[PDB]
Enzyme design. Structure first.
Site, mmCIF file in Angstrom:
data_model
loop_
_atom_site.group_PDB
_atom_site.id
_atom_site.type_symbol
_atom_site.label_atom_id
_atom_site.label_comp_id
_atom_site.label_asym_id
_atom_site.label_seq_id
_atom_site.Cartn_x
_atom_site.Cartn_y
_atom_site.Cartn_z
ATOM 1 N N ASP A 99 46.848 26.378 46.010
ATOM 2 C CA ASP A 99 47.352 26.495 47.445
ATOM 3 C C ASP A 99 47.789 25.018 47.822
ATOM 4 O O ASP A 99 48.554 24.994 48.951
ATOM 5 C CB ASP A 99 46.267 27.040 48.410
ATOM 6 C CG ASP A 99 45.038 26.101 48.399
ATOM 7 O OD1 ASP A 99 44.320 26.067 47.513
ATOM 8 O OD2 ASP A 99 44.780 25.482 49.719
ATOM 9 N N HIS A 141 41.108 22.907 57.684
ATOM 10 C CA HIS A 141 40.557 23.153 56.390
ATOM 11 C C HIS A 141 40.416 21.856 55.689
ATOM 12 O O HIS A 141 39.469 21.881 54.658
ATOM 13 C CB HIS A 141 41.138 24.260 55.423
ATOM 14 C CG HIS A 141 41.246 25.659 56.168
ATOM 15 N ND1 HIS A 141 40.176 26.339 56.686
ATOM 16 C CD2 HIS A 141 42.103 26.065 56.376
ATOM 17 C CE1 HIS A 141 40.611 27.278 57.239
ATOM 18 N NE2 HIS A 141 41.798 27.524 57.044
ATOM 19 N N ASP A 176 42.636 30.082 65.315
ATOM 20 C CA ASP A 176 43.213 30.611 63.921
ATOM 21 C C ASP A 176 42.500 31.801 63.591
ATOM 22 O O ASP A 176 41.409 32.076 63.503
ATOM 23 C CB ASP A 176 43.192 29.452 63.038
ATOM 24 C CG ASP A 176 43.973 29.428 61.602
ATOM 25 O OD1 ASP A 176 43.707 30.107 60.795
ATOM 26 O OD2 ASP A 176 45.110 28.831 61.622
ATOM 27 N N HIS A 178 41.547 32.103 60.350
ATOM 28 C CA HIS A 178 40.624 31.530 59.521
ATOM 29 C C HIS A 178 39.588 30.657 59.771
ATOM 30 O O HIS A 178 39.959 30.075 61.077
ATOM 31 C CB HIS A 178 41.285 30.621 58.243
ATOM 32 C CG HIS A 178 42.186 31.663 57.438
ATOM 33 N ND1 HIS A 178 43.468 31.446 57.896
ATOM 34 C CD2 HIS A 178 42.061 32.452 56.576
ATOM 35 C CE1 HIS A 178 44.271 32.377 57.034
ATOM 36 N NE2 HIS A 178 43.345 32.969 56.248
ATOM 37 N N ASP A 268 48.198 33.013 62.817
ATOM 38 C CA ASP A 268 48.000 34.012 62.138
ATOM 39 C C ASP A 268 47.222 35.378 62.347
ATOM 40 O O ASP A 268 47.205 36.518 61.577
ATOM 41 C CB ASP A 268 47.312 33.447 60.521
ATOM 42 C CG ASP A 268 46.474 32.287 60.559
ATOM 43 O OD1 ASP A 268 46.019 32.022 61.738
ATOM 44 O OD2 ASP A 268 46.113 31.831 59.581
ATOM 45 N N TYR A 312 52.352 32.583 59.349
ATOM 46 C CA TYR A 312 53.313 32.672 58.136
ATOM 47 C C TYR A 312 54.597 33.506 58.385
ATOM 48 O O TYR A 312 55.331 33.525 57.504
ATOM 49 C CB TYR A 312 52.430 33.361 56.915
ATOM 50 C CG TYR A 312 51.216 32.195 56.820
ATOM 51 C CD1 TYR A 312 51.463 30.869 56.096
ATOM 52 C CD2 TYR A 312 50.013 32.448 57.344
ATOM 53 C CE1 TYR A 312 50.762 29.759 56.151
ATOM 54 C CE2 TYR A 312 49.142 31.563 57.334
ATOM 55 C CZ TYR A 312 49.309 30.211 56.535
ATOM 56 O OH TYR A 312 48.268 29.296 56.837
#
Ligand SMILES: O=C(CS)NCCCCCC(=O)Nc1ccccc1
Ligand SMILES: [K+]
Ligand SMILES: [K+]
Ligand SMILES: [Zn+2]
Length: 398
Positions: A99, A141, A176, A178, A268, A312
């Site tokens: 990634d 992250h 987010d 995530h 997202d 995205y």
């Protein structure tokens, strides 16, 4: 004064990655097509007097060997020759693969976001801006020595470090889809940076944290009870997500009384995002979860850092971020921002087809137990940190 991180080299750098393509350009050009730029104060990205200065700044969080490997990765991707077996192993040891692969501008691209969020934190410190927006930042992250979830350098951790080191308390809010693991882990042992992440969590879904482990972990040492998490099931709409986060946001402000708020606003969660997990919109009347959260955060009147992150569906991320931008001008400056429901003409207009509208093309007990657990965590945080608060006025919010 509302600040926005922008620059010509900055735009070229934020647009140089294979994952995010020209997203930054779409966001910034939609904001500009909507006549928002004259209302904002351009915050130029930070620059350093020498390479050693830059290294000192990035290594305030990241290990030197990781920064060295990420710079060597850029150098190797600027040559035609394939990587040696030794260079592949070295990159694999920093998770600079999958990634997070290399590409010709990997180091410049990731450092640019740090440059932007550090300059954004500075404009807040010197009181030049009441709020600063960086749609090129929000890389939640990234770890000390590890690239993760499309994040190489943690611009958020660095911006927060600059804010606390300027008692100073920072409330970090991560909207987010995530879990904001990198930021949470960086400040895991520090009570001064309270982190709060709302996200999807399910078996096999990245990163796996911000939910029940093997119990619910919440910080360690003097940082115990300082990391907050709200894991949510898939399919949540604007209203349920807003009702889930709202009392939590208000209670954290009352108890912590932060000096700064840092908001990662990853797009997202949108219903039109290719993840298709949460059902959030960018609707402003049926109100957008993002817009409700931002408005609530801005009503506190605490210097705020608004950052990007995931998202995205580039045109839909631009539609949301354009609305968040307009809302911030309106909430901070007090002047109405009338934004046409139709996309104005600009070089990127064709990307908003086939209808060219501002609204995203979308037709719309576990939380109570999470609220009771979080309220008890907040009380334990306040007791440990000898913070004075009214129990009832906070309980009444839920
Ligand atoms: O979207 C975000 C950040 S806000 N995180 C999602 C998690 C990353 C997915 C895991 C992965 O390693 N994907 C991957 C694997 C091989 C090649 C390219 C991507
Ligand atoms: K989150
Ligand atoms: K913390
Ligand atoms: Zn994300």
């Amino acid at each position: 004064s509302v600040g926005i991180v922008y620059g010509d080299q900055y735009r070229q750098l934020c647009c140089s990655s294979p994952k995010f393509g020209d997203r930054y350009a779409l966001v910034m050009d939609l904001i500009n097509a909507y006549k928002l730029i004259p209302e904002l104060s351009r915050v130029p990205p930070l620059q350093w007097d020498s390479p050693s200065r830059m290294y000192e700044a990035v290594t305030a969080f990241h290990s030197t060997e990781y920064v060295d490997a990420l710079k060597k990765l850029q150098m190797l991707h600027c040559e035609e020759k394939e990587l040696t077996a030794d260079d592949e192993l070295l990159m694999d040891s920093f998770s600079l693969n999958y990634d997070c692969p290399g590409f010709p501008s990997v180091f410049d691209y990731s450092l640019a976001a740090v440059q932007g969020s550090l300059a954004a934190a500075s404009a807040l410190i010197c009181r030049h801006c009441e709020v600063v927006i960086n749609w090129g930042g929000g890389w939640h992250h990234a770890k000390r020595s590890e690239a993760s979830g499309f994040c190489y350098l943690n611009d958020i951790v660095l911006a927060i470090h600059r804010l606390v080191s300027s008692q100073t308390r920072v409330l970090y809010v991560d909207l987010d889809l995530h879990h904001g693991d990198g930021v949470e882990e960086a400040f895991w042992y520090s009570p001064r940076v309270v982190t709060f992440s709302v996200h999807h969590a399910s078996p096999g879904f990245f990163p796996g944290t911000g939910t029940w482990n093997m119990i619910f972990l919440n910080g360690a040492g003097r940082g115990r009870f300082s990391a907050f998490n709200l894991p949510l099931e898939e399919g949540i709409n604007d209203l349920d997500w807003s009702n889930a986060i709202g009392p939590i946001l208000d209670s954290l402000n009352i108890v912590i009384q932060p000096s700064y708020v840092v908001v990662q606003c990853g797009a997202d969660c949108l219903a039109t995002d290719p993840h298709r997990i949460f059902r959030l919109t960018n609707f402003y009347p049926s109100l957008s979860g993002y817009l409700y959260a931002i408005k609530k955060i801005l009503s506190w009147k605490v210097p705020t850092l608004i950052l990007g992150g995931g998202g995205y569906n580039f045109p839909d991320t631009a539609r949301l971020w354009t609305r968040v931008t307009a809302l911030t001008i309106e909430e901070v400056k007090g002047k109405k921002m009338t934004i046409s429901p139709e996309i104005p003409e600009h070089s990127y207009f064709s990307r908003y087809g086939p209808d060219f509208e501002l609204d995203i093309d979308y037709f719309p007990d576990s939380i109570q137990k999470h609220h009771r657990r979080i309220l008890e965590q907040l009380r334990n945080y306040a007791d440990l940190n000898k913070l004075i608060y009214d129990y009832d006025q906070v309980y009444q919010l839920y």
